[PDB]
Amino acid sequence: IEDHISFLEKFINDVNTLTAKLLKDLQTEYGISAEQSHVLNMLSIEALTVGQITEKQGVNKAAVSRRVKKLLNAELVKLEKIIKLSNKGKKYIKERKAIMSHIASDMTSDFDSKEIEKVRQVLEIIDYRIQSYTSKL
Amino acid sequence: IEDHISFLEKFINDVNTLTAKLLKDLQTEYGISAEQSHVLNMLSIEALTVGQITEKQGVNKAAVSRRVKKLLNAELVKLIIKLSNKGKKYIKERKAIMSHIASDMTSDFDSKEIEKVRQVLEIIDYRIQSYTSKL
């Protein structure tokens, strides 16, 4: 009830702890820092400004800047202007989705796509609401 | 199933987005960065010796090392490293914000619906941890 908030916090912590570990090598192979990939996956969504990324993240603006340039030095992301992803950066995101999808299947081998449908409908609606709140200050 | 993973990925991204904005003013008011707040947030649960404090985040040796102490000074942390009273009070405040907003956002839902939501995230989390542990 405010216990769901905690669970949700724990659930997220776990996904990060897992995704981190699952993506270690690939990040090494790319030269990437964890916080850098999360920017790449953050842009995997479209294109954002360095303030947007800092404001959607909540870390020191300088740090976001230090990671945004390193991605342009590595040709992982390009510019419009705004900051898009480069193809090099895409094959990455693509190599990520592939590792994610392999494990997600194990853990969801025995589910009911109908069970899942309703649950997702409830989330898209919560997601919709979270976004509206965010825009207003 | 890739679209299911994209959504969860996005879903999370917003939650994180939103929590940041919603706590910014209060974290600034306590003089701490967001990153110092999960450090407290992880301790809202337990108390931890550096290793495990990093065992969840999994980032740098220095990132952990130069935020841990800051907090003792701000006086919201103790060493082990457990919460301090001022720290305990911060969380109380943090939980307020989060709960009112989450409530007033789920309010029109049939507990039955939300419950099946949590039950499917629990099964999913149960498998993650188990899998995590298998490294």
Ligand SMILES: O=C(N[C@@H](CO)[C@@H](O)c1ccc([N+](=O)[O-])cc1)C(Cl)Cl
């Ligand atoms: O933006 C920053 N520094 C610039 C200028 O030196 C950048 O060159 C930089 C790159 C890498 C690192 N290093 O710590 O990973 C620091 C700074 C600040 Cl984090 Cl010091």
Ligand SMILES: O=C(N[C@@H](CO)[C@@H](O)c1ccc([N+](=O)[O-])cc1)C(Cl)Cl
């Ligand atoms: O890896 C993270 N990065 C984001 C979360 O929004 C970043 O803004 C951030 C990192 C660490 C902490 N701190 O509380 O541990 C807060 C925020 C998690 Cl906290 Cl989700």
